[PDB]
Amino acid sequence: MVLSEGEWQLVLHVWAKVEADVAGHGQDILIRLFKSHPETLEKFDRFKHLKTEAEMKASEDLKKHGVTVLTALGAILKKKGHHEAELKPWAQSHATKHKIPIKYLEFISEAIIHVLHSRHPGNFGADAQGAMNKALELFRKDIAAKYKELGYQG
Numbered sequence: 532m533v534l535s536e537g538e539w540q541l542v543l544h545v546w547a548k549v550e551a552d553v554a555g556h557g558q559d560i561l562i563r564l565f566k567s568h569p570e571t572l573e574k575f576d577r578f579k580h581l582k583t584e585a586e587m588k589a590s591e592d593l594k595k596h597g598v599t600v601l602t603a604l605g606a607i608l609k610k611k612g613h614h615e616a617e618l619k620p621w622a623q624s625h626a627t628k629h630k631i632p633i634k635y636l637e638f639i640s641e642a643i644i645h646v647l648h649s650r651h652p653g654n655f656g657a658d659a660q661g662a663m664n665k666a667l668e669l670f671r672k673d674i675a676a677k678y679k680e681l682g683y684q685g
């Protein structure tokens with residue numbers, strides 16, 4: 532798939548707002564993921580012990596990982612489809628070290644859209660959501676192909 536420039540502009544315009552508060556958005560997104568699909572929490576030996584939303588919100592460690600996640604994702608989106616070099620080391624660790632199935636990437640994709648919609652309604656109308664969805668689908672497609680190359684395709 533290929534996004535048009537107008538679609539990239541919609542994605543990067545809401546992303547610019549997200550970057551006004553990277554830590555807060557990262558926390559919101561990971562907490563939404565873990566609440567909506569608690570099985571994903573099991574992949575994180577680091578966070579496995581967190582029992583309630585309250586404990587999640589109070590974890591400095593979770594907040595630091597959310598910054599790491601959104602910073603990496605941001606770097607990929609700003610490549611506007613030219614993200615081959617960035618995707619390679621990402622795919623290798625998520626496939627053979629952490630073992631993250633494509634299904635879980637769909638789940639975090641859903642969490643990202645939920646948080647953007649909730650915090651940025653005026654810059655995240657139907658057309659901008661459609662563009663963000665297509666960018667994240669482009670990302671999952673490319674990761675699926677890489678997984679396969681790497682011998683995981685999970």
Ligand code: HEM
Pocket residue numbers: 571572574575576577599600601603604620621624625629631635636639
């Ligand atoms: C937008 C999707 C995601 C991005 C951009 C992302 C990014 C990252 C980055 C940059 C790291 C640190 C370096 C590394 O280990 O490769 C990391 C670690 C990790 N990720 Fe992801 N990730 C994503 C989705 C997920 C999902 C869906 C899960 C699990 C359900 C996951 C599980 C992990 C684990 C277990 C670690 C190691 C945490 C630790 O330090 O103990 N990732 N991720």
